[PDB]
Amino acid sequence: ATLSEEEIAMAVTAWEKGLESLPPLRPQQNPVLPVAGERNVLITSALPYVNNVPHLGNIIGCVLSADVFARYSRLRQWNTLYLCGTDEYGTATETKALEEGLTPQEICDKYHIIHADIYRWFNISFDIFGRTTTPQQTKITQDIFQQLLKRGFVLQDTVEQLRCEHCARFLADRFVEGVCPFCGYEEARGDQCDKCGKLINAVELKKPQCKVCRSCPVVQSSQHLFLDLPKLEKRLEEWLGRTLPGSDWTPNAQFITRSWLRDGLKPRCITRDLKWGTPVPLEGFEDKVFYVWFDATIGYLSITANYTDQWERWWKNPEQVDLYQFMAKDNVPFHSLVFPCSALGAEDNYTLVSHLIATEYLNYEDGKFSKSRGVGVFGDMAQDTGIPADIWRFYLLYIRPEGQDSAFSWTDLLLKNNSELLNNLGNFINRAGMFVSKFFGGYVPEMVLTPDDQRLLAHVTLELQHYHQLLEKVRIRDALRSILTISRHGNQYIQVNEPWKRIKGSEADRQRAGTVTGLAVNIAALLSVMLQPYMPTVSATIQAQLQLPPPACSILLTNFLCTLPAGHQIGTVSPLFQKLENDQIESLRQRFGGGQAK
Ligand code: MET
Ligand SMILES: [Zn+2]
Ligand SMILES: [Zn+2]
């Protein structure tokens, strides 16, 4: 805990320079567009499937992780566009719509609102939260398809598929029964005979049956399109070899990507026999659509396009734009292989991802989230617990599954709330603001820095730079702890100086009390901005209580500044956090535990 004289003297200088170090801000732009010469940060979160209510695992892995970095990116004055939206096409949407007695468009409109409401409550600051079911999706999907077709990256072949003429549909291996051509087992599945173990193709079945209507399916050759990834594999590895090293792709994402390439890429079918999907502009495909995962990633582009005319300045400008993509592990192959191949094969100067951020999975307690069994906290339930959104944000981010899986624990939430928020972070900021309001009439006291004060000030600056160091590489988990480290330093500073005692003392002792008090609240002011990407409501609350000027609230410099000079008037202070009670938590834990199921 010992620095250099140069370190201490440098940090002090930057501090004393004050609010004059602050570039008067730039007016907010709508739409946000890339600005030449400056850093332009494009951020996408994986588009959640619309017809499933998201749980805390989904949220922390994608929208919440992306939001933290998005908010940090704005504090660094980077031109930031954070976009997301609902993934809506697919067979599951047709199955769920029918089950709910609605049209696919109806059930999508319904659940899109549910998603948006959940993300609003969690305070996810999307610049756009769009939809994949738009005319612009069809247009952009078809264009990219056309660019790939004429360059010979699309194959066309026929597939023998069992079709039930009564159900008027092609059958999945799990919907077809039949007798085994290898052992004669009369009730074999289309995928496997459980009797002799043989892995089969459904068409090999004798006397096939549709397990829905029990009719006899007939073999039909249907036309299908394919993306020739083997022909695109070369240019994909050239791009990967150019961009992976020195990047901040999460280790798991890199491994998965290189792992798929080690096997070798295969031709992927990009068409489906469906009605709900982006239509294929080709002869004889009037009743087929693009496969969801072929154009779901194109949704990123179409969502941006519904937002602005100049969407190609973001998505076709790799020289000015650094793309960050946040997703879960299972989404990586589509973002690191499928879409890059499609984009590179289209040869339209596309912005490709620079840093892929893929998290491990968040477990609920000792198991997994399950709407089926009533286990776990889902996004629509979190609003009803009496626990504020920022408390959810803090804890989920404190245990964000980066290197390995993590598990949500009600017991741990209570401990971390009471220890880190109440008895640490909140305690420091409460005392800081309280001392100004009580001892100095709400005016920040004069600050006469001792050598020990300069050390603290320099230590705070180093933690701030460490904080920057981490969040610059999307180390969200560790930067949060950096915040708590500064706060823990501040509590020690207050405790040893005992300003609330010294204030009732000699001429000299009252000056020390004021210096400590003033420096403390300037640290509090800094903490509020650092906390902004994590707990935006509390951040604003602190800034309201301290009346921190809007320009100081909008930027985070790499140096600890004096944002509250001597004579600055603060507002009215009030305890930041509430204690979490044991009875309160046991009740919530029993509610989401599964033992109260139906
Ligand atoms: C274009 S990202 C789509 C991700 C998909 N909706 C999922 O939840 O896995
Ligand atoms: Zn068999
Ligand atoms: Zn049938």
Side-chain angles (χ1 to χ4, degrees), residues 1-24 26-27 29-597:
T2 35
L3 311 83
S4 63
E5 305 178 32
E6 180 187 294
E7 264 161 73
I8 294 171
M10 210 172 284
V12 159
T13 313
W15 189 78
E16 286 177 346
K17 184 172 133 153
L19 301 114
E20 289 319 307
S21 184
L22 221 74
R26 193 155 331 178
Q29 307 281 355
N30 220 340
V32 187
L33 298 161
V35 176
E38 298 169 356
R39 194 183 192 203
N40 310 315
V41 182
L42 185 62
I43 300 169
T44 69
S45 175
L47 313 172
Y49 172 70
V50 65
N51 292 127
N52 287 326
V53 184
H55 55 65
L56 300 187
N58 301 120
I59 288 164
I60 187 52
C62 302
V63 295
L64 188 56
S65 274
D67 181 67
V68 174
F69 183 76
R71 294 179 178 269
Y72 171 80
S73 174
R74 298 191 188 109
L75 282 175
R76 296 295 307 269
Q77 308 304 136
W78 302 333
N79 302 307
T80 313
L81 186 71
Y82 175 25
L83 68 114
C84 197
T86 47
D87 190 342
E88 305 184 22
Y89 285 133
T91 308
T93 297
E94 291 187 349
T95 304
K96 282 168 171 293
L98 151 66
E99 280 171 352
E100 290 207 21
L102 298 172
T103 75
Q105 185 69 244
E106 276 185 300
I107 197 185
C108 282
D109 298 342
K110 166 182 175 182
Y111 277 87
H112 173 80
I113 295 175
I114 290 161
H115 278 264
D117 284 338
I118 294 180
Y119 303 147
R120 253 190 295 278
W121 187 83
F122 274 88
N123 216 344
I124 311 296
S125 54
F126 305 119
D127 291 277
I128 325 105
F129 187 68
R131 305 181 66 174
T132 55
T133 55
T134 76
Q136 191 77 246
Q137 161 83 359
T138 301
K139 188 178 177 198
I140 295 174
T141 302
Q142 283 183 346
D143 173 39
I144 295 175
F145 167 73
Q146 292 296 346
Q147 283 290 80
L148 280 161
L149 182 68
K150 82 184 61 197
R151 288 174 179 76
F153 297 124
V154 181
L155 290 165
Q156 171 161 343
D157 202 14
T158 77
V159 181
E160 306 310 314
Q161 293 159 334
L162 289 177
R163 178 173 180 88
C164 171
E165 286 161 331
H166 195 251
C167 286
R169 75 176 189 186
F170 293 102
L171 267 49
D173 282 13
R174 65 184 183 276
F175 291 157
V176 47
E177 208 185 9
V179 45
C180 184
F182 290 96
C183 77
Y185 182 62
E186 280 178 338
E187 316 217 307
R189 296 188 309 269
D191 61 88
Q192 189 183 15
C193 172
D194 289 328
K195 194 61 184 178
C196 71
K198 188 82 176 187
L199 284 181
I200 66 155
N201 288 315
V203 296
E204 304 168 16
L205 277 179
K206 310 283 189 174
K207 287 174 156 42
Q209 275 192 294
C210 170
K211 262 206 164 301
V212 176
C213 68
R214 285 286 191 154
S215 70
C216 297
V218 59
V219 187
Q220 285 187 32
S221 58
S222 68
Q223 219 66 24
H224 274 305
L225 294 183
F226 297 82
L227 193 57
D228 218 333
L229 300 177
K231 305 168 91 100
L232 290 169
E233 194 189 303
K234 178 169 142 188
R235 66 183 59 188
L236 170 70
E237 271 167 343
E238 305 183 312
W239 161 72
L240 282 169
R242 262 165 31 222
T243 49
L244 275 193
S247 79
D248 296 312
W249 283 52
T250 47
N252 53 5
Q254 295 190 48
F255 163 82
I256 291 169
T257 302
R258 284 168 320 210
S259 205
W260 278 68
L261 285 170
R262 168 157 69 259
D263 293 340
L265 288 180
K266 276 60 174 179
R268 296 280 89 180
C269 182
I270 57 161
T271 53
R272 290 298 189 273
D273 303 305
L274 297 173
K275 295 297 159 294
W276 189 243
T278 296
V280 181
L282 188 71
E283 2 289 325
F285 281 90
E286 300 81 24
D287 289 273
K288 289 169 196 279
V289 291
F290 282 115
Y291 173 52
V292 277
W293 256 126
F294 163 69
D295 78 315
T297 167
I298 291 166
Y300 294 130
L301 279 61
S302 71
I303 287 165
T304 316
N306 288 328
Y307 167 70
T308 180
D309 260 335
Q310 321 192 45
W311 66 272
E312 285 169 300
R313 292 188 46 182
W314 279 108
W315 287 105
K316 293 177 178 171
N317 188 14
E319 226 74 54
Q320 291 299 336
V321 180
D322 312 324
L323 175 57
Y324 288 75
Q325 299 204 280
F326 289 78
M327 69 203 66
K329 240 172 27 165
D330 52 353
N331 284 13
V332 166
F334 297 107
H335 294 73
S336 68
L337 305 168
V338 179
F339 181 81
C341 284
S342 310
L344 284 163
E347 311 184 0
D348 201 350
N349 197 39
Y350 274 110
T351 309
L352 295 179
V353 55
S354 286
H355 318 275
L356 203 165
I357 314 297
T359 50
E360 294 299 320
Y361 287 107
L362 171 76
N363 299 329
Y364 182 75
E365 295 286 356
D366 58 341
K368 286 230 118 85
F369 298 86
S370 176
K371 193 76 123 173
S372 186
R373 313 186 290 267
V375 181
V377 175
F378 282 71
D380 57 340
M381 313 168 161
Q383 315 185 33
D384 204 37
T385 61
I387 296 182
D390 274 13
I391 300 308
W392 296 97
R393 286 181 68 105
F394 173 82
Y395 177 62
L396 291 175
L397 290 166
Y398 190 87
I399 64 171
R400 175 181 183 253
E402 306 192 335
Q404 51 161 131
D405 297 344
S406 60
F408 182 100
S409 179
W410 281 106
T411 288
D412 214 47
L413 164 65
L414 178 138
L415 263 68
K416 288 302 152 58
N417 177 89
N418 292 351
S419 77
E420 296 297 343
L421 296 183
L422 191 65
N423 285 345
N424 177 17
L425 174 62
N427 194 40
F428 172 73
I429 300 182
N430 287 340
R431 287 150 92 194
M434 168 188 171
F435 295 159
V436 167
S437 206
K438 184 172 182 182
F439 302 149
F440 302 95
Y443 295 96
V444 179
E446 264 275 305
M447 291 157 279
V448 176
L449 303 180
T450 63
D452 286 326
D453 300 326
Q454 296 192 328
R455 171 161 258 81
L456 178 88
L457 191 144
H459 271 134
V460 169
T461 301
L462 288 194
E463 271 303 327
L464 177 65
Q465 289 171 355
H466 182 51
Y467 169 93
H468 280 302
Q469 192 184 300
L470 300 162
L471 256 174
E472 279 170 5
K473 293 199 193 82
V474 201
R475 311 216 197 259
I476 296 164
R477 183 192 196 95
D478 281 322
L480 176 52
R481 279 158 175 80
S482 183
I483 295 178
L484 298 165
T485 295
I486 295 178
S487 174
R488 183 168 54 251
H489 282 342
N491 282 308
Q492 202 188 32
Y493 179 59
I494 297 191
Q495 195 57 46
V496 298
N497 280 266
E498 292 175 343
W500 68 95
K501 289 176 207 198
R502 311 301 185 83
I503 189 52
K504 308 169 153 51
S506 65
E507 255 277 6
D509 276 19
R510 327 184 299 221
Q511 194 179 270
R512 275 308 288 156
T515 292
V516 171
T517 286
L519 183 48
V521 306
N522 272 275
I523 299 181
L526 171 63
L527 284 176
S528 76
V529 188
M530 303 178 58
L531 195 65
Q532 202 237 108
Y534 292 82
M535 311 170 77
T537 294
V538 160
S539 167
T541 295
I542 298 163
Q543 286 162 8
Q545 289 188 23
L546 308 181
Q547 297 211 35
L548 188 66
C553 301
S554 286
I555 191 181
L556 193 55
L557 292 188
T558 61
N559 288 112
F560 177 29
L561 295 193
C562 180
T563 52
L564 306 177
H568 168 86
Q569 207 182 15
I570 76 169
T572 52
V573 297
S574 170
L576 291 182
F577 304 109
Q578 287 303 117
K579 165 215 214 316
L580 286 185
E581 304 274 18
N582 290 69
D583 285 337
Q584 177 195 19
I585 293 304
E586 179 66 41
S587 180
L588 296 172
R589 187 224 251 157
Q590 289 165 2
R591 166 178 171 184
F592 301 107
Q596 302 182 0

PDB file of all heavy atoms in Angstrom, residues 252 359-362 399-407 477:
ATOM      1  N   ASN A 252     -13.853 -18.934 -23.326  1.00  0.00           N
ATOM      2  CA  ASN A 252     -14.774 -19.997 -23.709  1.00  0.00           C
ATOM      3  C   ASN A 252     -15.253 -19.834 -25.151  1.00  0.00           C
ATOM      4  O   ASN A 252     -15.348 -20.809 -25.892  1.00  0.00           O
ATOM      5  CB  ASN A 252     -15.969 -20.051 -22.753  1.00  0.00           C
ATOM      6  CG  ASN A 252     -16.667 -18.711 -22.604  1.00  0.00           C
ATOM      7  OD1 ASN A 252     -16.335 -17.742 -23.285  1.00  0.00           O
ATOM      8  ND2 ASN A 252     -17.647 -18.653 -21.710  1.00  0.00           N
ATOM      9  N   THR A 359     -20.871 -15.612 -21.651  1.00  0.00           N
ATOM     10  CA  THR A 359     -20.789 -16.033 -20.258  1.00  0.00           C
ATOM     11  C   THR A 359     -21.160 -17.501 -20.084  1.00  0.00           C
ATOM     12  O   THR A 359     -21.846 -18.083 -20.924  1.00  0.00           O
ATOM     13  CB  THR A 359     -21.719 -15.185 -19.354  1.00  0.00           C
ATOM     14  OG1 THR A 359     -23.034 -15.141 -19.922  1.00  0.00           O
ATOM     15  CG2 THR A 359     -21.194 -13.770 -19.221  1.00  0.00           C
ATOM     16  N   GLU A 360     -20.710 -18.093 -18.983  1.00  0.00           N
ATOM     17  CA  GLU A 360     -21.205 -19.398 -18.572  1.00  0.00           C
ATOM     18  C   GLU A 360     -22.635 -19.244 -18.052  1.00  0.00           C
ATOM     19  O   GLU A 360     -23.226 -18.170 -18.159  1.00  0.00           O
ATOM     20  CB  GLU A 360     -20.297 -20.017 -17.508  1.00  0.00           C
ATOM     21  CG  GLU A 360     -18.896 -20.352 -18.008  1.00  0.00           C
ATOM     22  CD  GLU A 360     -18.900 -21.375 -19.134  1.00  0.00           C
ATOM     23  OE1 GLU A 360     -19.698 -22.336 -19.075  1.00  0.00           O
ATOM     24  OE2 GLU A 360     -18.104 -21.214 -20.084  1.00  0.00           O
ATOM     25  N   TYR A 361     -23.195 -20.308 -17.487  1.00  0.00           N
ATOM     26  CA  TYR A 361     -24.598 -20.273 -17.085  1.00  0.00           C
ATOM     27  C   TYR A 361     -24.790 -19.990 -15.598  1.00  0.00           C
ATOM     28  O   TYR A 361     -23.993 -20.408 -14.758  1.00  0.00           O
ATOM     29  CB  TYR A 361     -25.293 -21.584 -17.466  1.00  0.00           C
ATOM     30  CG  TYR A 361     -25.530 -21.712 -18.956  1.00  0.00           C
ATOM     31  CD1 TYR A 361     -24.772 -22.584 -19.731  1.00  0.00           C
ATOM     32  CD2 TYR A 361     -26.504 -20.948 -19.590  1.00  0.00           C
ATOM     33  CE1 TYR A 361     -24.982 -22.695 -21.096  1.00  0.00           C
ATOM     34  CE2 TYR A 361     -26.720 -21.052 -20.954  1.00  0.00           C
ATOM     35  CZ  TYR A 361     -25.956 -21.927 -21.700  1.00  0.00           C
ATOM     36  OH  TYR A 361     -26.167 -22.034 -23.057  1.00  0.00           O
ATOM     37  N   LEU A 362     -25.858 -19.262 -15.292  1.00  0.00           N
ATOM     38  CA  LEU A 362     -26.251 -18.993 -13.916  1.00  0.00           C
ATOM     39  C   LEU A 362     -27.243 -20.045 -13.435  1.00  0.00           C
ATOM     40  O   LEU A 362     -28.356 -20.141 -13.952  1.00  0.00           O
ATOM     41  CB  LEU A 362     -26.867 -17.599 -13.791  1.00  0.00           C
ATOM     42  CG  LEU A 362     -27.510 -17.268 -12.442  1.00  0.00           C
ATOM     43  CD1 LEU A 362     -26.441 -16.970 -11.395  1.00  0.00           C
ATOM     44  CD2 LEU A 362     -28.501 -16.114 -12.563  1.00  0.00           C
ATOM     45  N   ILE A 399     -22.008 -11.797  -8.901  1.00  0.00           N
ATOM     46  CA  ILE A 399     -21.750 -13.215  -9.140  1.00  0.00           C
ATOM     47  C   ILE A 399     -21.873 -13.600 -10.613  1.00  0.00           C
ATOM     48  O   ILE A 399     -22.117 -14.763 -10.934  1.00  0.00           O
ATOM     49  CB  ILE A 399     -22.703 -14.104  -8.320  1.00  0.00           C
ATOM     50  CG1 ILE A 399     -24.152 -13.890  -8.762  1.00  0.00           C
ATOM     51  CG2 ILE A 399     -22.532 -13.829  -6.832  1.00  0.00           C
ATOM     52  CD1 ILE A 399     -25.125 -14.874  -8.157  1.00  0.00           C
ATOM     53  N   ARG A 400     -21.695 -12.628 -11.503  1.00  0.00           N
ATOM     54  CA  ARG A 400     -21.774 -12.871 -12.944  1.00  0.00           C
ATOM     55  C   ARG A 400     -20.847 -14.007 -13.383  1.00  0.00           C
ATOM     56  O   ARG A 400     -19.638 -13.949 -13.162  1.00  0.00           O
ATOM     57  CB  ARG A 400     -21.435 -11.593 -13.713  1.00  0.00           C
ATOM     58  CG  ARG A 400     -21.373 -11.762 -15.219  1.00  0.00           C
ATOM     59  CD  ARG A 400     -21.010 -10.449 -15.895  1.00  0.00           C
ATOM     60  NE  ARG A 400     -21.008 -10.558 -17.350  1.00  0.00           N
ATOM     61  CZ  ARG A 400     -19.910 -10.574 -18.098  1.00  0.00           C
ATOM     62  NH1 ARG A 400     -18.716 -10.477 -17.530  1.00  0.00           N
ATOM     63  NH2 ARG A 400     -20.006 -10.672 -19.416  1.00  0.00           N
ATOM     64  N   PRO A 401     -21.422 -15.050 -14.005  1.00  0.00           N
ATOM     65  CA  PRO A 401     -20.682 -16.261 -14.379  1.00  0.00           C
ATOM     66  C   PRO A 401     -19.727 -16.039 -15.552  1.00  0.00           C
ATOM     67  O   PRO A 401     -20.106 -16.236 -16.705  1.00  0.00           O
ATOM     68  CB  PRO A 401     -21.795 -17.243 -14.757  1.00  0.00           C
ATOM     69  CG  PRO A 401     -22.908 -16.373 -15.235  1.00  0.00           C
ATOM     70  CD  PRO A 401     -22.840 -15.118 -14.405  1.00  0.00           C
ATOM     71  N   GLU A 402     -18.494 -15.652 -15.256  1.00  0.00           N
ATOM     72  CA  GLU A 402     -17.533 -15.319 -16.300  1.00  0.00           C
ATOM     73  C   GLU A 402     -16.662 -16.515 -16.695  1.00  0.00           C
ATOM     74  O   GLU A 402     -16.742 -17.004 -17.823  1.00  0.00           O
ATOM     75  CB  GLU A 402     -16.658 -14.146 -15.848  1.00  0.00           C
ATOM     76  CG  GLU A 402     -17.468 -12.937 -15.397  1.00  0.00           C
ATOM     77  CD  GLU A 402     -16.629 -11.685 -15.230  1.00  0.00           C
ATOM     78  OE1 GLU A 402     -15.410 -11.811 -14.990  1.00  0.00           O
ATOM     79  OE2 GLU A 402     -17.193 -10.574 -15.336  1.00  0.00           O
ATOM     80  N   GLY A 403     -15.834 -16.982 -15.769  1.00  0.00           N
ATOM     81  CA  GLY A 403     -14.959 -18.109 -16.038  1.00  0.00           C
ATOM     82  C   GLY A 403     -15.677 -19.437 -15.913  1.00  0.00           C
ATOM     83  O   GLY A 403     -15.486 -20.341 -16.725  1.00  0.00           O
ATOM     84  N   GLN A 404     -16.514 -19.553 -14.887  1.00  0.00           N
ATOM     85  CA  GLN A 404     -17.269 -20.775 -14.649  1.00  0.00           C
ATOM     86  C   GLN A 404     -18.723 -20.464 -14.320  1.00  0.00           C
ATOM     87  O   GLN A 404     -19.117 -19.298 -14.244  1.00  0.00           O
ATOM     88  CB  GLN A 404     -16.641 -21.575 -13.509  1.00  0.00           C
ATOM     89  CG  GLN A 404     -16.388 -20.755 -12.258  1.00  0.00           C
ATOM     90  CD  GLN A 404     -16.205 -21.616 -11.023  1.00  0.00           C
ATOM     91  OE1 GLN A 404     -15.252 -21.435 -10.263  1.00  0.00           O
ATOM     92  NE2 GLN A 404     -17.124 -22.551 -10.812  1.00  0.00           N
ATOM     93  N   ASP A 405     -19.520 -21.511 -14.126  1.00  0.00           N
ATOM     94  CA  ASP A 405     -20.903 -21.335 -13.706  1.00  0.00           C
ATOM     95  C   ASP A 405     -20.955 -20.712 -12.319  1.00  0.00           C
ATOM     96  O   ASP A 405     -20.054 -20.908 -11.504  1.00  0.00           O
ATOM     97  CB  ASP A 405     -21.659 -22.669 -13.698  1.00  0.00           C
ATOM     98  CG  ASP A 405     -21.761 -23.295 -15.071  1.00  0.00           C
ATOM     99  OD1 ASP A 405     -21.530 -22.587 -16.074  1.00  0.00           O
ATOM    100  OD2 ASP A 405     -22.087 -24.499 -15.143  1.00  0.00           O
ATOM    101  N   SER A 406     -22.013 -19.951 -12.063  1.00  0.00           N
ATOM    102  CA  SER A 406     -22.293 -19.460 -10.723  1.00  0.00           C
ATOM    103  C   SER A 406     -23.715 -19.852 -10.363  1.00  0.00           C
ATOM    104  O   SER A 406     -24.472 -20.308 -11.217  1.00  0.00           O
ATOM    105  CB  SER A 406     -22.102 -17.947 -10.634  1.00  0.00           C
ATOM    106  OG  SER A 406     -22.971 -17.273 -11.524  1.00  0.00           O
ATOM    107  N   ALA A 407     -24.078 -19.683  -9.098  1.00  0.00           N
ATOM    108  CA  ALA A 407     -25.403 -20.070  -8.640  1.00  0.00           C
ATOM    109  C   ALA A 407     -26.053 -18.961  -7.828  1.00  0.00           C
ATOM    110  O   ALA A 407     -25.433 -18.396  -6.927  1.00  0.00           O
ATOM    111  CB  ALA A 407     -25.326 -21.349  -7.821  1.00  0.00           C
ATOM    112  N   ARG A 477     -17.363  -8.201 -13.496  1.00  0.00           N
ATOM    113  CA  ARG A 477     -17.333  -8.752 -12.145  1.00  0.00           C
ATOM    114  C   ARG A 477     -16.282  -8.073 -11.264  1.00  0.00           C
ATOM    115  O   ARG A 477     -16.565  -7.681 -10.132  1.00  0.00           O
ATOM    116  CB  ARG A 477     -17.068 -10.257 -12.210  1.00  0.00           C
ATOM    117  CG  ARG A 477     -17.076 -10.980 -10.883  1.00  0.00           C
ATOM    118  CD  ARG A 477     -16.524 -12.391 -11.046  1.00  0.00           C
ATOM    119  NE  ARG A 477     -16.841 -13.242  -9.905  1.00  0.00           N
ATOM    120  CZ  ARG A 477     -17.890 -14.055  -9.851  1.00  0.00           C
ATOM    121  NH1 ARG A 477     -18.722 -14.132 -10.881  1.00  0.00           N
ATOM    122  NH2 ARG A 477     -18.106 -14.795  -8.771  1.00  0.00           N
TER     123      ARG A 477
END
